Amino acid sequence: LPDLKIEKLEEGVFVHTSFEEVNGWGVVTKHGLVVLVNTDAYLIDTPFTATDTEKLVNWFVERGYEIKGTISSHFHSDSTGGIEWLNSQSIPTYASELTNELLKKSGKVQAKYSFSEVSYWLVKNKIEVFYPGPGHTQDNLVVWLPESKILFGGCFIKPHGLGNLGDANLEAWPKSAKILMSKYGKAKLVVSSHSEKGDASLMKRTWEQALKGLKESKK
Ligand SMILES: C[C@@H](O)[C@@H](C(=O)O)[C@H]1CC(SCCNC=N)=C(C(=O)O)N1
Ligand SMILES: [Zn+2]
Ligand SMILES: [Zn+2]
């Protein structure tokens, strides 16, 4: 499978794309972000593997950046697979307390730092972490970049098919989608884990898909 790809979105915002075969889903394409604050870099989700996480870190280190911190949007491996490697390099990893306990219960390595707040400033006025409510998972988070007006929706944004429902809360997802739409209507760009980037309407598409999946789940 190809190496991690890095693509600039605009000044200070990069998309990282990694590929992994996962048991019954075939090769998964996963998008995360790298956000620059001056000469500091922040990883928004880890790629699937230690190897891709190392390639990503080394790419920004070679371009003169310090990796100040990572945030995992939820406990699944497409958001957290790099945490063990980052910890071994003493790069600060962050997850919600709920995410870290879901990781523990799954026998996975935890982020070194956790937080319980619904709205958490990873970097004050630069990187906000928000819990809209359950959807894709009980713990899923989004990341908001107030300066660029970019929203990273992770595996919660699902405009054309909900994907893995194993850990999903179909009852809550529509309500959580409305909360997200209410908070981030002013997003100029929505980046998701597995879909094409788009405008704020991807939040409304997610609301519609969640309702459609909830109606389906009731034979
Ligand atoms: C591999 C694991 O992280 C998994 C998950 O988080 O549930 C991946 C694989 C999947 S299915 C791949 C994409 N299919 C439809 N969007 C999803 C997802 O549904 O968000 N994420
Ligand atoms: Zn997931
Ligand atoms: Zn996913």
Author numbering: 4 to 222
Show passages lifted from the paper.
The most solvent-exposed parts of the four antibiotics are very distinct, while in addition, imipenem has no pyrrolidine ring in the antibiotic tail. The terminal part of the imipenem tail was modeled in three different conformations (50%:25%:25% occupancy), highlighting the extreme flexibility of this moiety. Due to the different conformers, the interaction network is different in every modeled position: conformer A creates a hydrogen bond with the backbone carbonyl of Val30 and water-mediated hydrogen bonds with the backbone of Thr32. The most solvent-exposed conformation, conformer B, lacks interactions with surrounding residues, most likely interacting with a water network, while conformer C interacts with the wider water network. In addition, Trp28 shows interactions with the pyrroline methyl group (C-21), present in all the antibiotics studied other than imipenem. The lack of this interaction in imipenem could lead to a reduction in binding interactions to the loop and may contribute to the observed reduction in affinity (increase in Km) for imipenem. In contrast, imipenem lacks this additional methyl group, which reduces the strength of the lipophilic interaction with the Trp28 side chain, thus resulting in greater loop flexibility. Furthermore, as shown by both shorter and longer overall simulation times for all the complexes, the tail of imipenem shows high flexibility and occupies multiple rotamer positions; thus, it does not contribute further to the loop stability. In contrast, imipenem shows weaker binding (Km, ca. 50 μM), consistent with the higher L1 flexibility. Notably, the kcat for imipenem is 2 orders of magnitude higher than that for meropenem and ertapenem.
